[PDB]
Amino acid sequence: GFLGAAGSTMGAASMTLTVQARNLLSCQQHLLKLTVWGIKQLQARVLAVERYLRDQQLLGIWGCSGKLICCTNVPWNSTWSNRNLSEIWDNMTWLQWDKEISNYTQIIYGLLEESQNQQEKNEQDLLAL
């Protein structure tokens, strides 16, 4: 299936991440003569494009572009999940996960942007002797 049930073993589910991304992109007078109908459909297309681009831009700025699973250089903070690792991969369910970490969503992202910035900053001086 296109989406799995996402109940456990997301590591296997990961084999489909490619299709999920692929399907994000894809009458004449039948619609052209109709002003409201035509504008609603264009609005839908545009917003779909914007969603696509925001996700890709974030992966880029965080240094995760091109990967489906990205290991970062930002440590896990205890506040995010006080639960130990054993429960997260199998005991937790990804949708259930997302509810609990709603509050620490932006902070995860700011740290990722900053660490990527620091890495590129440092690259400049590896080239400069």
Binding site: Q20, A21, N23, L24, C70, C71, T72
Partner: protein
């Protein structure tokens, strides 16, 4: 814990409830056919999701709001380019039609002075009218709509015959469906699957009795957002349909007159046969058995051995007191009081006909429906009912239900019941053992 790092994933198959517009798809001169250009998928792919329990709320289902809005919009779009009938808001001179009288005051023979192609002349012409469209001026009559609002003639070449419509999600969205045969109005059902487009639903409009919809797979189901609240309506889904045979048996012809430069008006001319009243035939035994099944289910919420009564509705406009039909473009208002005439513990329904139609209880924007030539037969499958529960009952042993009615989103609420729309959210995080 000391070795955990942030990891981020993309394309994760999870979602949140969301609203977005849907695309209209079809198959196979027809408004809906022209609108719903996109063809359906001959092979939709239903994905069963095993570890899913999900809460559905048909009563907070946004799909209903869109279907309603879009239908009223298409109705107007199809009427926009048609000939306006303002010139007919004149004194009308009427007499009774006694010519081949049936003895079943419904039909009048009326005349008026209409402008010819030149502005300098008007011609006296005549046509036939139904009393439901004509009101007396204290032989002097006026059309009813002219009392409050403008009217436009429906185009004679434009069809509104229902075509099942499948609504399809935009990329990034998915339509989820509840497959639980006993699913009630709200709740976390365990039979959940994902589809790209809905099952097609014909845009059938009726009041009181729901025609050509879906049947319950197992048993008749009674659904409501709040069944104990008498302010809410009750929707009933049947497991078996009941066939109903309807007719407008009078063989007549139509006239066409010139109002102006390329402006034509079509109207009922003489009946070219004798005259008899319109009606619907419901099998008697089937109806009584069907109702008994409903009663068995009502007892679940109203008491194991309570007294259940069916009665005629309160009065009001025909749109809420009779059964509304649209057969070939003609509108009927059938008397269904005999279908609700019993207490539990070949039925002929006479039908009224009218040509001035209001849509979705919106005050103006009246429409005129030119007649069908010859006669018309209409056959349909009843799939459900709208019932209203009486309030004010202090005697707990008796509960009375009457035919209900109201806004047409709710016919669609029933057909769209099993559907929900969500947005897919591809990013997420987890702790990991790996690091850069």
């Amino acid at each position: 814990a000391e070795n955990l790092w942030v990891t981020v994933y993309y394309g994760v198959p999870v979602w949140k409830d969301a609203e977005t517009t849907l695309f209209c798809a079809s198959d196979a001169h027809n408004v809906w056919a022209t609108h719903c250009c996109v063809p359906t998928d001959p092979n939709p792919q239903e994905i069963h999701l095993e570890n899913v329990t999900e809460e559905f709320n048909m009563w907070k289902n946004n799909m209903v709001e869109q279907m309603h809005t879009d239908i009223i919009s298409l109705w107007d779009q199809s009427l926009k380019p048609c000939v306006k009938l303002t010139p007919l808001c004149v004194t009308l001179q009427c007499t009774n039609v006694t010519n081949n009288i049936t003895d079943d005051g419904e039909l009048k023979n009326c005349s008026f002075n209409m402008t010819t192609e030149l502005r300098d002349k008007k011609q006296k012409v005549y046509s036939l009218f139904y009393r439901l469209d004509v009101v007396q001026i204290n032989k002097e009559y006026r059309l009813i709509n002219c009392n409050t609002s403008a009217i436009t003639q429906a185009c004679p070449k434009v069809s509104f015959e229902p075509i099942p419509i499948h609504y399809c999600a935009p990329a990034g969205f998915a339509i989820l469906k509840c497959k639980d045969k006993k699913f009630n109005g709200t709740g976390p059902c365990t039979n959940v699957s994902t589809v790209q487009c809905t099952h097609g639903i014909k845009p059938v409009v009726s009041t009181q009795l729901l025609l050509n919809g879906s049947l319950a797979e197992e048993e008749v189901i009674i659904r409501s957002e709040n069944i104990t609240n008498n302010a809410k309506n009750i929707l009933v889904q049947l497991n078996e349909s009941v066939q109903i045979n309807c007719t407008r048996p009078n063989n007549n012809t139509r006239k066409s007159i010139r109002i102006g430069p390329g402006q034509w008006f079509y109207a009922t001319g003489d009946i070219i046969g004798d005259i008899r009243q319109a009606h619907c035939n419901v099998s008697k035994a089937t109806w009584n058995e069907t109702l008994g099944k409903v009663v068995k289910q009502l007892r679940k919420h109203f008491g194991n051995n309570t007294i259940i009564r069916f009665a005629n509705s309160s009065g009001g406009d025909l749109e809420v007191t009779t059964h509304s039909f649209n057969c070939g473009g003609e509108f009927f208002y059938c008397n269904t009081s005999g279908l609700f005439n019993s207490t539990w513990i070949s039925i002929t329904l006479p039908c009224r006909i009218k040509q001035i139609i209001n849509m979705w209880q919106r005050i103006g924007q009246a429409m005129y429906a030119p007649p069908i030539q010859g006669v018309i037969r209409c056959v349909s499958n009843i799939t459900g009912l709208i019932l209203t529960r009486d309030g004010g009952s202090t005697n707990s042993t008796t509960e009375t239900f009457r035919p209900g009615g109201g806004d047409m989103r709710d016919n669609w609420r029933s057909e769209l019941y099993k559907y929900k729309v969500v947005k897919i959210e591809p990013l997420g995080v987890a702790p990991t053992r790996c690091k850069r």
